[PDB]
Design a protein around this ligand. Structure first.
Ligand SMILES: Nc1nc2c(ncn2[C@@H]2O[C@H](COP(=O)(O)O)[C@@H](O)[C@H]2O)c(=O)[nH]1
Ligand SMILES: [Fe+3]
Ligand SMILES: [Fe+3]
Ligand SMILES: [Fe+3]
Ligand SMILES: [Fe+3]
Ligand SMILES: [Fe+3]
Lengths: 363, 361
C-alpha cells in the first residue's frame, strides 16, 4: 500500500535541505530535483537572468558551469519576456522548440511546461521548466497550478539566498574599510587587515573549531589594531624607533581597541575586543600589556598573534626585505612554545603553503 | 487533489523564506502545522540559556510567554527528548489546565515532539493540539509531525543565524563609527540616533524599504574621517584659526577616502554621506559648495538629521532647544542649509524624532 502523505513528506525534507543551504548552485539543484519528483517529470531546469551579459543561464549537471541561454529564443525565451505560461503537448509540433540538444544526445522531448519566476516586486526574474511528464501523456491544468506554487517557493528561496550573500559581503566590506581608518597615520595596508583574518580562518578551521567561530575569527581578527586611532600623533607618527615613555603609550593601543569594541553584545565584538587587547601577548607570558600566559590568552588572541606576525615578516618594512618561506618556517619553529602557541604553531606550519598563496594573491 | 496540502506547504514556505523576523517565522510555522496536521492549535517552545526557561509567542504579536522547562508537557519533552502523545489531556497529570481556564478552551489531544539543532541538541518543542477528528493523533500523524519538526528546526536556525548577522552588522558599524571616542566628544548614541532619524525621514520621503535600511546604517559613519585629522588641530585647546579650520573641513574628504571603492551599496552611500554631510542646499557649504540635487539625497537627509540631534542636546551654557524653537529653525533654514522638500517631510514627522531622542538619550 501507498502512503497518502508521501509527497508531502518528500517536500518537507527538500524544504529543510534548501533552508540550510547558503550556496545558490546547490539551492538551484535541489529545487530542480524537487520539481522532478513533485511534478513527476523526467527533467527540470531553472533559468535566471544576467543583467550584464543580457542572457538567461542554467546549471546542467551538478558541479559544472552556467550554460548561456538566449533570453529571446525558445520556450524559456517566450515565457521570460511575455510572462505567460506555456504548456506544450508535443514539442516537435512546436516551432519555438530547439531540436538540436535533443538530437545530439539520444533524447526525445515530448511535453514541456514552463512558467515564469517573479520577485517580491512582481518582476520577471526567470523561468521554471519541466520536461516529459512520466505518469501522464500531458501536463494538466492541475500540473500548471502546482508548478506555479513551486515557482513562488523557488523565487523566494532564490531571493533570500541572494540577499543573504549581499548582506554578508556588505558586512565584510564594512569591517575591512573601517578597520583601515588608521590609513592616514599608520603604514599598515588594507590587504594586511584582510589577510590577517584569512590566515586565522585557516588556523581555526584546522584546529577543529565550530564553523561559526571559523567565520568569527576571519572577521574579528582584522580589527586588532583599531585602538591606534586613540594614540597621540607624536607617538604614532614618530620616524624610526621609540623611547620608553612613548612605548608605554604605544602599548596602550591594545587597551584602546578593547575600549572601542567591548560595548557590543554580539559574539563578533566580544571576540574582536579580546583580540584587540590580546594580540601582543606571548605564549611565554613575556608580552604586553599584562604578560598573560598560555591559556590565559583566548584562542582567538593566540591565533591572531601567529597570523599578524606571519604577515609582517613576509612584507617589506623599514630596513628589512620580506622573509621567504624557508626563513619564515625557521623562525616559527624557533618561536614555537615561546612567542606562540605550540599546538597552533604546528597547525600553521602544516598549512604554510596556503598562508603563502594568500599572501601571493592579495598583495 | 492530495495536492491541496502540497500547495498549502509551498505557500507557507514561500512566506517563511522571505520572513526576516523570528517572531513571524514561528507564527507561520504554527499556522502551517495547524493546516497540515488538520489540528486546531499548535505551539513552538524554544529554550533560553540565560533565564533557563522555555518560551513561546502567541499570535497578535504580544510579548514572549515564559514556561517552566521542568514541569508540564513541553517541559517533559524538552528534558527527555521523548515524544508525548496524549489522547486526553484531562487525564494526564503533567497537564496544566489553567490555559483552558482563562481562554474558554478545552484541550483534548496533545502531541509534542523535540526540536534538534544541526549539532543534534534539544533546542525546543513542537506541540500540536486538538486534532480535528476529535480522536487521537495517529502513528502516521507522529511521523508527519517529525518531518514538520525537521523543517521547523532548519528554518528557525536559519532565522536565528540571520538575526545574529544583522545584529553583528549593526554593532560593528556603531562601535567602529565611535572609534573617534578618544579625541572627539560626539557620543555613541548620537551616532546611532542620526541613523534612526534618517531612517524615518527616508521612509516618509517614499524611498524603497531596502534603501531606508541603508541610510539607517550608512549615516552613522559620516564623521569617520576625523581619525585622520592631525592632533595639533582636533586637540588644540584654543579656537581654530583659518589654516586649522581648512584642515578640519578635510574630515569630509578623509571619510570618503576611508569608505569608497568598497563594492557594496552600503559603502558607496556611506562614502557619499561622509563627503557631503556639510554641503548646504544653497551651495554655501563645504568642502565643494555643491548645490541642490548635486548633493545625493542621502547626504541631504543626514545633514537634517545631524543638525536636529545637535540642537536638541544640552551643552554647558547652551540648553537643548525645545520643539517650537527647533521647528522655527528648520523653517528659517528651508532652501538654505536644507532641502525644502525634505524639510517639510521632517517637520511633518518631528514628533517621531523627539521620541527617538527621548528613548535613546
Ligand atoms: N621578530 C620580528 N618580529 C617582527 C618583525 N617585523 C614585525 N614583527 C612583529 O609584528 C608584530 C606586529 O605586526 P605589524 O604591526 O607589523 O603588523 C610585532 O609585535 C612584531 O612582533 C621582525 O623583523 N622580527
Ligand atoms: Fe598591535
Ligand atoms: Fe600592529
Ligand atoms: Fe560632526
Ligand atoms: Fe562632520
Ligand atoms: Fe554628529
Amino acid at each position: 500500500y501507498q502512503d497518502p502523505e508521501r509527497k508531502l513528506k518528500i517536500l518537507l525534507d527538500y524544504s529543510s535541505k534548501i533552508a540550510n543551504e547558503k550556496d545558490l548552485r546547490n539551492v538551484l539543484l535541489f529545487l530542480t530535483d524537487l520539481a522532478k519528483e513533485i511534478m513527476e517529470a523526467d527533467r527540470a531546469s531553472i533559468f535566471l537572468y544576467d543583467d550584464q551579459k543580457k542572457t538567461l543561464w542554467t546549471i546542467v549537471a551538478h558541479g559544472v558551469d552556467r550554460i548561456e541561454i538566449d533570453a529571446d529564443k525558445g520556450i524559456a525565451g517566450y515565457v521570460f519576456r511575455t510572462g505567460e505560461i506555456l504548456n506544450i503537448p508535443d514539442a516537435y509540433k512546436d516551432p519555438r522548440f530547439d531540436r538540436d540538444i535533443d538530437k545530439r544526445t539520444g533524447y526525445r522531448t515530448r511535453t514541456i511546461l514552463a512558467v515564469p519566476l517573479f520577485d517580491r516586486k512582481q518582476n520577471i526574474i526567470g523561468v521554471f521548466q519541466v520536461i516529459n511528464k512520466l505518469t501522464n501523456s500531458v501536463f494538466t491544468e492541475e500540473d500548471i497550478e502546482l508548478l506555479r506554487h513551486i515557482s513562488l517557493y523557488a523565487s523566494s528561496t532564490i531571493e533570500n539566498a541572494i540577499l543573504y550573500e549581499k548582506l554578508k559581503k556588505a558586512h565584510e566590506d564594512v569591517i575591512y574599510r573601517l578597520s583601515h581608518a588608521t590609513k592616514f597615520k599608520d603604514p599598515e595596508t588594507q590587504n594586511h587587515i584582510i589577510r590577517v583574518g584569512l590566515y586565522a580562518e585557516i588556523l581555526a578551521r584546522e584546529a577543529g573549531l565550530d564553523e561559526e567561530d571559523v567565520e568569527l575569527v576571519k572577521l574579528a581578527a582584522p580589527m586588532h589594531d583599531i585602538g591606534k586611532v586613540g594614540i597621540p600623533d607624536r607617538v604614532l607618527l614618530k620616524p624610526g624607533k621609540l623611547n620608553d615613555e612613548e612605548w608605554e603609550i604605544m602599548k596602550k593601543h591594545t587597551i584602546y581597541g578593547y575600549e572601542i569594541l567591548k560595548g557590543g553584545d554580539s559574539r563578533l565584538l566580544q571576540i574582536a575586543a579580546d583580540i584587540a587587547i590580546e594580540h601582543h601577548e606571548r605564549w611565554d607570558g613575556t608580552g604586553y600589556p599584562f604578560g598573560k600566559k598560555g591559556e590565559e590568552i583566548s584562542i582567538y588572541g593566540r591565533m591572531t598573534s601567529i597570523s599578524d606576525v606571519f604577515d609582517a615578516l613576509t612584507s617589506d618594512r623599514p630596513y628589512k626585505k620580506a622573509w621567504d618561506m624557508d626563513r619564515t618556517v625557521r623562525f616559527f619553529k624557533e618561536q614555537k612554545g615561546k612567542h606562540f602557541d605550540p599546538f597552533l604553531t604546528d597547525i600553521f606550519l602544516k598549512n604554510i603553503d596556503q598562508m603563502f598563496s594568500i599572501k601571493r594573491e592579495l598583495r
